[model samples]
Target: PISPIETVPVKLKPGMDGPKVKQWPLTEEKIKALVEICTEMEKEGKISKIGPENPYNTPVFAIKKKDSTKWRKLVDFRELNKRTQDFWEVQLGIPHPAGLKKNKSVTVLDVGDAYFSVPLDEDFRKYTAFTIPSINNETPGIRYQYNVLPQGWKGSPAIFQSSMTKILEPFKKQNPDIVIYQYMDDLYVGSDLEIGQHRTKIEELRQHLLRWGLTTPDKKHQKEPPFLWMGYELHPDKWTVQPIVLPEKDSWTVNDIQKLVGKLNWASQIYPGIKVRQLSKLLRGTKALTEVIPLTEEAELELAENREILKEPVHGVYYDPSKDLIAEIQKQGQGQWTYQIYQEPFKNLKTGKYARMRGAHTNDVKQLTEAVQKITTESIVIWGKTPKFKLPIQKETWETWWTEYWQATWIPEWEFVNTPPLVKLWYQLE
Candidate 1:
């Protein structure tokens, strides 16, 4: 019974036109798969026949699935996107997982073939058309276009979100006690008032979705005593949202940088105050490049540190020692200096316990100077006792400690040299 929601007409930019990119080369196996999928989609009312007279056309590509032989069809809409006017506005803000109550039972819902559920205006269908080769070399190739919202279109996500917002309005009004969070095709429901409340809400939502002509796959529905929403593990008992670990490669191409940065950006939303902005520097000016950018020793180390930090709980306050200490440098000789750090005890403030936090020997005054100036202005934590101070700690011994400790703990704070100017601008804006 599911049907597509009516969508707004697509408009081109003023004084601009859409480009017709040539079709990418494809193998015979790929061509057969594409033809079969296109046929299935047309039969299901997702796409329709279009004439060759269309001015706007885009190329299509297949993305291979990992550990499988299947391929997902994707349109190269960048040229079309460039000429299209962006009239779609976001209707729903992404929900912060940290805001959810720890006592709630949770359920996640994934709408099946979400984009295809939204109808496209007939007049704008040609703008989404792409050409596919004939399955048998005997017939002329055909041109087809989406009758519903298509993936890879610039405005698709915004339009889909707006339509979903309207569909969810009645459910929200009827069940004021339940909290709902939506991101594109995924919807999460949480209930804190009672046990099994989430189940009732899920069933109610399912009925509403059916009535609204949207279908959710049975396999995609998940009930969680410990919810996994938006890539974060939300636990009622633990009262924290922990990020899921994702695999990282030692080297990354320009494309890999983009994907990795995107993943970090999503994780940063749930785990606020992450170093994603700092790590995003590797992607500057990479928008046009296709070459591989090997991860430097420093960058790799930071990536590892970020992964480790994601495993920590999101609810508790964590004190960073590097940010809390006050540091001063005493010049010993050319290219040599004694670095001293003073740390005030986190607790028992009235007793006034203060001691030497750390000492190091460094040849790079710039590094040492930057380290001192980078101390956080946030309120420092106070705990337990403070030991007596020692001055002029041996430089040889300090070097050993410095090598171990800095490599272990200071990688996140270490600044990179020769960063692109635009990368700096981007980080500043962030």
Candidate 2:
């Protein structure tokens, strides 16, 4: 069993009032499971029975594991998170697997019940209390609270990351050959060594983990398949990182849009240059849980296009526009207008070479069309470049277009004026 860190007290956001108590009605099976788990945790000194006088209380919900009968209890600390100022300290900065080689040995380790391994500050446990329907009538209004760092707590991830970092520091200092990358509970160790050497290093790591009272399940450890890292599959043979593809939906609600945007953000880090601005446009001014907007036809199309793009391989050679052909056209026929046209040579995954077309200025439609045609047909072909075209638009420009064309057209006009309370407070503070 792991002992508590016994250092600083759990800090809360200053000047914030305690949240109201929330009670969850539990089913018979769920109540039994909760009681059993609570009993076990009490025996293990992970939690203590608390009285009804606690100032802070949160709800507890059970989520079923994927493809398994086991259930994990999750505390809804969102209310507590809102009251804490440092809740946004959760960092998503996991290392990118862009330049990893094929021959490099890789091992992934998961810290079993990682959050619980880091003990919570004793004084903070009262704020994490939750009450369920009494397991029996004998204990009428009694509740239990976690003494350890509980899952779903607002500050759990940051606390766990810090503790794990300290615990792994000695191992990292001694084994400079092994590259360690951690994201919350997941630990990845990679090295360019023979199997025998790598196994020896892994055993050393195991001993260090044992010393630190950290546990790793046998099933959760993986070696071989050096290309796989942090939910991204790297292709050393192709010399490119594979694009991430998410499930497609014909239409999405507000929450659905939020989830998709988050996934797209993660995928973009793995597969650089994947566009997400158009999809993220749906999330503007969505401060209230009841506020929901349906996905536009264009948004749906963008999702499909993103999936297709992820299927393609990304090359290391980036297009240099300064080296490519650039032309400007002056139109004086109807409206005085200037059209700037540019064509850059790019290496397509399938095709060897392609000239990307780009044009700016909107005053003269005819001039813009003629300028694009000239750049694609004459300027690129004359320079011995492929006639194929790929338009590279800036993410800011895409967001602007989406905001004007799609969001302005569909979103309720009242939403713009309905500033949320927090936003209003921020403006007032400013």
Off by over 4 Å in 2: 1-5, 19-27, 63-71, 85-109, 112-119, 133-142, 160-163, 177-182, 188-207, 218-430
- Models 1 onward score TM values of 0.42, 0.43
Candidate 1 per-residue lDDT, tens place, 183-227, comes to 333455667655455555567787788778756533322233454
Error of 2 at 182 (Å): 4.3
Which stretch of 10 consecutive residues in model 1 shows the poorest summed lDDT? Answer: 376-385
The residue-by-residue lDDT of candidate 2 on 1-430, one tens digit each, is: 6683574466666777666755655566766766777778788888788875785677765544221244555565657755662334433223334323332655545453667756777777787787766655556744787878766553665566666778889998988766665433345566777666776677678668877774642232223344321221112233233322354452346666676666666556445666777777767865554456776655566677777776765554454433544443333224332223234322322221112222433333334333334333332222322222222333344223322112000011010112222211101110
Each candidate: how many clashes? 5, 0
| CA-only RMSD, every prediction | 21.2, 21.2
